[PDB]
Amino acid sequence: MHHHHHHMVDEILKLKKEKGYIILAHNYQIPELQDIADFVGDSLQLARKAMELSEKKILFLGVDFMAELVKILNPDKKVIVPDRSATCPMLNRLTPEIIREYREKFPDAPVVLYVNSTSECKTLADVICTSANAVEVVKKLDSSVVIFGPDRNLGEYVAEKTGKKVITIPENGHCPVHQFNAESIDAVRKKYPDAKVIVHPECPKPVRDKADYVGSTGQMEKIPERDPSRIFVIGTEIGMIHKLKKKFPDREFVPLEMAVCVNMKKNTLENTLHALQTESFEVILPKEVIEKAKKPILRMFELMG
Ligand code: SF4
Ligand SMILES: [Cl-]
Ligand SMILES: [Cl-]
Numbered sequence: 001m002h003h004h005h006h007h008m009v010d011e012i013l014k015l016k017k018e019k020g021y022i023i024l025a026h027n028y029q030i031p032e033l034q035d036i037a038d039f040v041g042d043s044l045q046l047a048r049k050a051m052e053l054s055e056k057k058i059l060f061l062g063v064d065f066m067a068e069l070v071k072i073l074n075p076d077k078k079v080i081v082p083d084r085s086a087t088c089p090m091l092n093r094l095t096p097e098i099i100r101e102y103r104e105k106f107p108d109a110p111v112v113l114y115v116n117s118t119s120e121c122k123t124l125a126d127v128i129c130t131s132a133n134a135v136e137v138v139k140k141l142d143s144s145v146v147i148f149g150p151d152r153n154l155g156e157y158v159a160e161k162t163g164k165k166v167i168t169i170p171e172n173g174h175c176p177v178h179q180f181n182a183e184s185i186d187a188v189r190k191k192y193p194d195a196k197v198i199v200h201p202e203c204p205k206p207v208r209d210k211a212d213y214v215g216s217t218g219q220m221e222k223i224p225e226r227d228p229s230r231i232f233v234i235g236t237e238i239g240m241i242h243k244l245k246k247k248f249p250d251r252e253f254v255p256l257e258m259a260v261c262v263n264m265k266k267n268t269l270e271n272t273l274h275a276l277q278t279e280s281f282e283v284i285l286p287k288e289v290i291e292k293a294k295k296p297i298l299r300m301f302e303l304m305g
C-alpha cells in the first residue's frame with residue numbers, strides 16, 4: 001500500500017474500534033477493503049454471520065441486496081453502507097408484478113428467490129437461497145415444480161442437480177460479470193494441462209460443463225483444502241483471486257478471464273472512511289418489508305438443518 005492509502009486504513013481501523021462497528025465485506029470488494037474488514041465471505045456466510053454478531057453497529061461493504069438482508073436479520077441494529085447505489089443489475093429485472101404474474105400463471109408452485117433480489121421481491125418469496133445452498137433448499141421442498149429467479153443460469157443449474165422443473169423468471173436474468181466464453185477454458189487446458197478449473201454457478205452452462213468444480217465463492221475457497229492442485233483457474237469476479245491467493249499463498253490462481261463487477265467496486269477506501277466519520281448511509285427498510293421478508297430468509301436456514 002501507498003502512504004496516502006496507509007493513512008486512510010489507519011483512520012478506518014481507529015474509527016471502527018472507537019464507534020463500536022463491525023465491518024462485514026463481500027468477497028468481491030477491493031483488496032484494501034477486504035483487509036480492513038472484520039469478516040469477508042459470500043452471501044450465505046455473511047447472512048449466517050449477520051445472525052451471530054453481537055455489535056450494535058455494522059458497516060457493510062458489498063451491494064444493496066446483501067446490506068438489506070443483514071438489516072432484515074438485525075432490524076434494531078444500525079447498518080450503514082458507503083454508497084447506496086451499489087446494486088446488482090438483476091434486481092431491476094424481477095419485480096413484485098412479475099412474481100404475482102407467475103404465481104397466477106403457475107399456481108401451486110413455490111417461489112424460490114435468489115438472494116440477488118430486491119427486499120420487496122423477497123416479501124413474495126416462499127424461500128430465499130444463495131448459490132451455495134440453492135440445490136439443497138429446492139431439494140427439500142415438497143413440490144416437483146418451482147418458480148425461480150432472477151438468475152436463469154443458477155435456476156438451470158438447480159434443475160440439473162435436483163431433476164425438478166425450475167421455471168425461471170424473468171426470461172433472461174443473468175450476471176454479466178460471469179458470462180465467460182467456454183473457449184477460455186479450452187485455452188487454459190492447453191496452457192495448464194494439470195490445473196483445476198473452478199467456476200460460479202452463475203456462469204453459462206457451456207462454461208459450467210467444462211469446469212472441474214462449480215460453486216459459490218465460499219465453496220471455491222474451501223476446494224484447495226481437499227484438492228492438492230498447484231494451479232487453479234478461477235471463473236468468477238476478479239476480487240476473489242486476491243481472497244484465494246491470501247488464503248493459499250503456495251498455490252497459483254489464474255483468472256479464467258478478467259471480470260470486474262463495477263458495482264462491487266463502488267466502495268473505496270475514501271468513501272468507507274467517510275461512512276465511519278458520518279455514520280451514513282444508513283440502511284432503512286419499511287417495517288412491513290422487514291416483517292414479510294424475514295420469513296423466507298429464516299426458512300432458508302430451516303431447510304438447511
Ligand atoms: S458479480 Fe454479477 S451477480 Fe454479483 S453483484 Fe455483480 S453483477 Fe450482480
Ligand atoms: Cl415444501
Ligand atoms: Cl429478462
Ligand SMILES: [Cl-]
Nearest residue numbers: 248249250251
Ligand atoms: Cl497454500
Ligand SMILES: [Mg+2]
Nearest residue numbers: 277278279280
Ligand atoms: Mg450521518
